[PDB]
A paper describes a structure:
On the other hand, in W286F the electron density map of G2SG-OMe was defined at the −1 and +1 subsites, where this thio-ligand formed H-bonds with Asp95, Lys206, His207, Arg158, Tyr253, Asp285, Arg291, and Glu491, and stacking interactions with W286F and Trp434, whereas G2SG-OMe did not bind to W286A and W286Y. The dispositions of G2SG-OMe at the −1 and +1 subsites in the W434A, W434F, W434H, and W434Y mutants revealed similar structural features of the ligand binding to those seen in W286F. Notable was the behaviour of W286Y that showed increased catalytic efficiency values with (1,3;1,6)-β-d-glucan (laminarin), laminaribiose (G3OG), and 4NP-Glc, while these values in W434Y were considerably lower.
Author numbering: -3 to 602
Write the structure that this text describes.
């Protein structure tokens, strides 16, 4: 079609399937296996990318060009890698992926949205869509084209360290919140076939429905463990949102570390090929989790040859290696060379990978747009996060007796007020895991507004605001305070580090609440990724708010505390009386909740 050196796969006017087939037909085995390989930026160099025909890069949690890097530093990094991949014989661009799971959260100055559990409290799928949209822009600001989100796990036991990454214990809520997908990717056409991948263009990103399947059903909430449930329960609780994702054109699906009735998901051909590909008709690419194939065996890594065979025969298309690429490539090449893995399986994985890259426009815009850099941390996005944070708050108590004047909303004018607690002025704690570092961190880790900062920005100029992190009872009684706001809760955690069998917040937390509330009427703001033992905090407090992990915009908290808006959030999870009850979900025999799923008190705006 019209020049003498014309190559159909390079012609942007041709249909994606024709471009895929035309490119696939020219590729060597090495070129094919290279597409199937995703590596960490930490092991990538121009020569490694070129010589191994690498298909994809990622940043794992905390893998950044440097601390504090600007949006343009990210763009330059990603373009440097792309430049190498475009210099190969076939010039196939790489796709760069990152965990942008509550904003573009690895990046300094990125807007940090509430974590998923809080978003489930909003019951507002359109808000989540808009959060998708903002997140796509902030990811493209850094030159990155692919976000490992949404997590559509249905957490069935809050002892799990990733329970905050699940919108709800109720699959219906999780289903509703798959609107993140068309936020990230754009809306699919009227005509769209369910299971086809979609991304609108250069201002959107490929999404990833993760982690397939039953990641939130593991025994005792143990991370990466076994999920014991008949096919009917799997299909009724853990699967449904995957079908909503297919309907909205999710481009990729990541496989779970977890097992189903003892079968490693990363080795499960019946579910990956038989169900996801052959029954749901998924036509995007299937990606492993980080060393997910390694973890097929025990010990992990003990038979990498079998890891590669089992995973690729099960139907995985791209492997998140992410470090030992030479070994992965060498072993997979051996398997194809000895007939253990047929060419048809390679060609299917590469078809899927190229389908997503061509569909999303990556061959037409392989490089970053520097005009997008300024999207990072844009005030419109912070305003959105602030709206989400406010809508996520669940008011659990507002008055010790039914006859008390309701404490909330608090007045903005008062002579003197106290702000206290370990979580009142700690941005890191209010963001939780997957913020700047993998495990999150403490203190002023990025740009945002702590609860203390938000109180000071909200109150009348005549209101004196005193901060004390852990005041004693006498300090409070002697202080002349009108009221206190006290914020406490969980420390940041991610993944197995957050698996917790007792779910009691660290001290001092409760002790500070008791000392503050003992002296002056108090509003307790509980920061957590999940329900935690709360009766003692409730007993001390006039009012108590479950604020979850609200992110960078602390003003979302004060917007509701001071009555600019009313509380509307409703628990997206059951709140247990005791961890001995667990697991306990809306539906079981012994359903005896402290607060039932859907509970939440309200207030009216002042
Ligand atoms: C970088 O993510 C985590 O890093 C630690 C330490 O290097 C690993 O040992 C963990 O098992 C992974 S977990 C895995 O990471 C994916 C990529 O960051 C992520 O998308 C997925 O949701 C996680 O399960
Ligand atoms: C399928 C699976 O992951 N099972 C693990 C098992 O290997 C381990 O003995 C245990 C440790 O707590 O957790 C569970
Ligand atoms: C009261 C109690 O036992 N608290 C513990 C804490 O010390 C520990 O770090 C965590 C580990 O999951 O579990 C919780
Ligand atoms: C300040 C306040 O409590 N206002 C009201 C309450 O009396 C009522 O339950 C409802 C009626 O609109 O709205 C709220």
């Amino acid at each position: 079609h019209h020049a003498a050196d014309y190559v159909l796969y390079k012609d942007a006017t041709k249909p994606v399937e024709d471009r895929v087939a035309d490119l696939l037909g020219r590729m060597t085995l090495a070129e094919k296996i290279g597409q199937m390989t995703q590596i960490e930026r930490l092991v990538a160099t121009p020569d490694v990318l070129r010589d191994n025909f690498i298909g994809s890069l990622l940043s794992g949690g905390g893998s950044v060009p440097r601390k504090g890097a600007t949006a343009k530093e990210w763009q330059d990094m990603v373009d440097g890698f792309q430049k190498a991949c475009m210099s190969t014989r076939l010039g196939i661009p790489m796709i760069y992926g990152i965990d942008a799971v509550h904003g573009q959260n690895n990046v300094y100055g990125a807007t940090i949205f509430p974590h998923n559990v809080g978003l489930g409290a909003t019951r507002d799928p359109y808000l989540v869509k808009r959060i998708g949209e903002a997140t796509a822009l902030e990811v493209r600001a850094t030159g990155i084209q692919y976000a490992f989100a949404p997590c559509i796990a249905v957490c069935r036991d809050p002892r799990w360290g990733r329970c905050y990454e699940s919108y709800s214990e109720d699959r219906r809520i999780v289903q509703s919140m798959t609107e993140l997908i068309p936020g990230l990717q754009g809306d699919v056409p009227k005509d769209f076939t369910s299971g086809m991948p979609f991304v609108a263009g250069k201002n959107k990103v490929a999404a990833c429905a993760k982690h397939f399947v039953g990641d939130g059903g593991t025994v005792d909430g143990i991370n990466e463990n076994n999920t014991i449930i008949n096919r009917e329960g799997l299909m009724n609780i853990h699967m449904p949102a995957y079908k909503n994702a297919m309907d909205k054109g999710v481009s990729t699906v990541m496989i779970s570390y977890s097992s189903w009735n003892g079968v490693k998901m990363h080795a499960n051909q019946d579910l990956v090929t038989g169900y996801l590909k052959d029954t749901l008709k998924f036509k995007g690419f299937v990606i492993s989790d980080w060393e997910g194939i390694d973890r097929i065996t025990t010990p992990a890594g003990s038979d990498y040859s079998y890891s590669v065979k089992a995973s690729i025969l099960a139907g995985l298309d791209m492997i998140m290696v992410p470090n030992k690429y030479q070994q992965f490539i060498s072993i997979l090449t051996g398997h194809v060379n000895g007939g253990v893995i047929p060419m048809s399986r390679i060609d299917d994985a590469v078809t899927r990978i190229l389908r997503v890259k061509f569909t999303m426009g990556l061959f037409e815009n392989p490089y970053a747009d520097p005009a997008m850099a300024e999207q990072l941390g844009k005030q419109e996005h912070r305003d959105l996060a602030r709206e989400a944070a406010r809508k996520s708050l669940v008011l659990l108590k507002n008055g010790k007796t039914s006859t008390d004047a309701p404490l909330l909303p608090l007045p903005k004018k008062a002579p003197k007020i106290l702000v206290a607690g370990s979580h009142a002025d700690n941005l890191g704690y209010q963001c939780g895991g997957w913020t700047i570092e993998y495990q999150g961190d403490t203190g002023r880790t990025t740009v945002g507004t702590t609860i203390l900062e938000a109180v000071k920005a909200a109150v009348d100029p005549s209101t004196v605001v005193v901060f004390a992190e852990n005041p004693d009872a006498e300090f409070v009684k002697s202080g002349g305070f009108s009221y206190a706001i006290v914020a406490v809760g969980e420390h940041p955690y991610t993944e197995t580090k957050g698996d917790n069998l007792n779910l009691t917040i660290p001290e001092p937390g409760l002790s500070t609440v008791q000392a503050v509330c003992g002296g002056v009427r108090c509003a307790t703001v509980l920061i957590s990724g999940r329900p935690v033992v709360v009766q003692p905090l409730l007993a001390a407090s006039d009012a108590l708010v479950a604020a979850w992990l609200p992110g960078s915009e602390g003003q979302g908290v004060t917007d509701a505390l001071f009555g600019d808006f009313g509380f509307t959030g409703r628990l997206p999870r059951t709140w247990f009386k005791s961890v001995d009850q667990l697991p306990m979900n809306v539906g079981d025999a012994h359903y005896d909740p402290l607060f039932r799923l859907g509970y939440g008190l309200t207030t009216n705006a002042t």
